[PDB]
Design a protein around this ligand. Sequence first.
Ligand SMILES: [Cl-]
Ligand SMILES: [Cl-]
Ligand SMILES: [Mg+2]
Ligand SMILES: [Mg+2]
Ligand SMILES: [Mg+2]
Ligand SMILES: [Mg+2]
Ligand SMILES: [Mg+2]
Ligand SMILES: [Mg+2]
Ligand SMILES: [Mg+2]
Ligand SMILES: [Mg+2]
Ligand SMILES: [Mg+2]
Ligand code: NA
Ligand code: NA
Ligand code: NA
Ligand code: NA
Ligand code: NA
Ligand code: NA
Lengths: 95, 154, 140, 186, 156
Amino acid sequence: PSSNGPLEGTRGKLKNKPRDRGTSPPQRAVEEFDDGEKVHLKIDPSVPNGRFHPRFDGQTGTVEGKQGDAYKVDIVDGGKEKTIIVTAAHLRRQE
Amino acid sequence: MHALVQLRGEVNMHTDIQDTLEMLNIHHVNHCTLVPETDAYRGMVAKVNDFVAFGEPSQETLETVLATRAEPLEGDADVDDEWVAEHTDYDDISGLAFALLSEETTLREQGLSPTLRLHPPRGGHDGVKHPVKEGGQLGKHDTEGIDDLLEAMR
Amino acid sequence: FHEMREPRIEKVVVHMGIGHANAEDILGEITGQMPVRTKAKRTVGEFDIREGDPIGAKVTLRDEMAEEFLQTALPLAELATSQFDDTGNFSFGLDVTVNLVRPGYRVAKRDKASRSIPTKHRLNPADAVAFIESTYDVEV
Amino acid sequence: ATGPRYKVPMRRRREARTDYHQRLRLLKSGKPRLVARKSNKHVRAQLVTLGPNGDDTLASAHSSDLAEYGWEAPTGNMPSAYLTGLLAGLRAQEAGVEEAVLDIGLNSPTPGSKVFAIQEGAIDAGLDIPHNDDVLADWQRTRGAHIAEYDEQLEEPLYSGDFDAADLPEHFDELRETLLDGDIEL
Amino acid sequence: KPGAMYRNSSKPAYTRREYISGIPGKKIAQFDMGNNGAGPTYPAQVELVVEKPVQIRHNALEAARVAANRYVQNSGAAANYKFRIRKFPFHVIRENKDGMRAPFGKPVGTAARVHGANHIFIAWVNPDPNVEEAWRRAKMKVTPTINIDSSPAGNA
RNA sequence: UUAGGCGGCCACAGCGGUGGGGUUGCCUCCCGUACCCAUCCCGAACACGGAAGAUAAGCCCACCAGCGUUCCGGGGAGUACUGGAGUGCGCGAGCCUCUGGGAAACCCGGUUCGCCGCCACC
RNA sequence: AGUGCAAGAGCAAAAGAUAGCUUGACAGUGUUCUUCCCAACGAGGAACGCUGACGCGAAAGCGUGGUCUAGCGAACCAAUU
RNA sequence: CCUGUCAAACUCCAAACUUACAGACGCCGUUUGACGCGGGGAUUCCGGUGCGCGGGGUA
Ligand SMILES: [Cl-]
Ligand SMILES: [Cl-]
Ligand SMILES: [Mg+2]
Ligand SMILES: [Mg+2]
Ligand SMILES: [Mg+2]
Ligand SMILES: [Mg+2]
Ligand SMILES: [Mg+2]
Ligand SMILES: [Mg+2]
Ligand SMILES: [Mg+2]
Ligand SMILES: [Mg+2]
Ligand SMILES: [Mg+2]
Ligand code: NA
Ligand code: NA
Ligand code: NA
Ligand code: NA
Ligand code: NA
Ligand code: NA
């Protein structure tokens, strides 16, 4: 890479298809998860806050408590165990 | 149920392919195993497709091979009718063979090593550089095609 | 059907597009209510570089205040046709514009469930000339 | 509409009925919403909760089914609003609902407004709602005094036939009084 | 310089003029020749078909086209035929003209990418194929071997 | 749902167009400014008070595919591209065979003129 | 379109414009991610909390500077609270 | 309206394929103790080649 910021090489993954453009629905920004649930991490290009580092987009972790309204999801980067602070807006229920 | 025979060695073959063969209980050239025809197994042989010879053998042939190259989970013991009868659910080799073919049991389940360590093909095989459709010995075979190989390596 | 289809005057905007005012006074008497400043956009050569800047005033008259005004304005104008909107409006003159439309216009001006008026329910240049011409004067 | 790249608003935005930015802020509380809505002739008050396939209304009150309790006056005024609020508020309590936040939709937060009147009613019914007392009407106007005094400048009945000529903020008391004990559907 | 230096399609497509400056103008004079006033209303239609994907410098395009059309004057300056070269030199080409240090070359030309089997030239003629000859000389000045193909013409 | 309120999915719902519907559950337009409130000027809007009129807007109901969108048949196409294998071919660029996958444009014909939830309601 | 400045990205009853009001560009202390994929490493950065005090709003709520990714600096010594 | 062409820093589309998690089968581990945790000792940080995909370069 020519630079090493968090958004390096994120043009695709953090951009919306022309039609999904604009403010997202509030239903999923308010969804409630329970400790133990499996959730898919995917940043919503439309939602500014509650994001996590673009490198984890695609990960599927486990909800283990929360911090404020944001959730604390545990994942495994390669072989390293990591905890990720993320809001509902960027999480989906597995299955 | 297909008969799998490794015809190409490990040197230079992809590691993930080698592991697969290993998961199929074949760790040497000319070693053979019987595998059920399931989606999971199907995907496996496909990935192994270029270094093996497989096909559905005939009742007879399986019998000849079972008799000639089957072994207990441990030991020299010849697997003959008597052995089959005094150790398995069936009464004789034919009975075992049929059950295998109809995928009702497996060589392990009956206390037999999952591997039939065959002999080098008498008269030689068709080449390990081309597939069957090309006159080679690699890939899927005919029941008659697998039988010849298996019988040559009996 | 009619009654709710027949035209009506909705606001008459009287504005003096000066270039920098004392003019409000006359608009106040000519209409009958306070005028509003007219700020401008963009910086331009007519020493009009100031963005927020009084550069004229206007006055939007509704109901009687509008008629009682047109009952002298119109007479001071001759023109008609071509000088009419495609929506049945027209400006003459110091400017004096007359916005015309039919009974259910609020549907497009309210907050809740607002909706654009259907081309069919719009007012045509012709249907406009009729209404007005039919009120103390002549067309073309 | 124009092309594959065109962006069509969410239905309820097209219909100019839901303010989604406000809705999201509303849902933040995690409490039931006290939906205060009006019509040219009536006033509605619902207690909505979030649901898998959409909102769930656990209790509601309409200015029309107000008569069902002895209302004999118009239903698009302040006294009406308050009462519908209190009515829905009560049915709410019955439902086991204890607190809510006020959703006034696309209406304006004007002081002494009917939506705030609705809010006052729901509060008195016993519902716990984040509010501000001095944004509410001064009780008398809630009662309908502003209208009684307006008919004082009579000369012609403010009410076409309807009931009374000089109107009744008292009829208001009689009703509130009624709703505060027993009766069906409460 | 030799065609050997640029005739292969091994490099990435380089055509974004928004990121490339100083690109030499093309030597290709025209793309439409003959009676361009008329539309393809002819009996016969022959085409010059390139048989290998290659890059053809605007250099070769112009020499090949001239050699074909300049010859199609076996029919006259205002003869009855229309000649078309359908490809355009989009691919910008460089040269490293220090040694291999900072070797990203400087724009020196343009070339058109043609894949095997495309037709680079298409002429329209009445049963009067002098064009077939205008192409024996045309594929004479372009890198690939070529195939002279006739389309509407069962007049053999 | 003989017209309502809050929504979910966010064009299958958009754009355009036709027909039908109201002494009332109703929604509207509509009528009107003493009040709460309101316009840097206007009761336009916002807010409040109210029914003389209307179904012309909106809205609801029925329907039209010309445009846009979704999905499907047949054709393009097992074509383009591609994971695995080859002492197959080619001066080479590159191609071919076996094996596991598999498109886009476009054309023709269907589909789509929203679906679903909760509450309230001759 | 605009949103201070590269480029890419976000944004329409707004993240833009106008008006008004306000100083949350607040003190304290953390969690996590990043810096440094995996996988150890400082300063820096960010996200998300809590305690305290405040601003605005009817209220939910929003404000841990500017929509996001650049604008930064160890020990020793000095000056400052 | 017709007609001729393109894109590493274009995209209405869109693979093969790579990849997170889960279940199944396989293989493995529970005297050969896997997965993992803690600690001791290193070497190493001139690499090369084939094949696939590359970026530069006439090569
Ligand atoms: Cl993170
Ligand atoms: Cl409302
Ligand atoms: Mg990319
Ligand atoms: Mg043994
Ligand atoms: Mg021999
Ligand atoms: Mg051989
Ligand atoms: Mg009608
Ligand atoms: Mg921010
Ligand atoms: Mg020093
Ligand atoms: Mg100092
Ligand atoms: Mg990859
Ligand atoms: Na969105
Ligand atoms: Na040098
Ligand atoms: Na040649
Ligand atoms: Na001013
Ligand atoms: Na109507
Ligand atoms: Na740090």
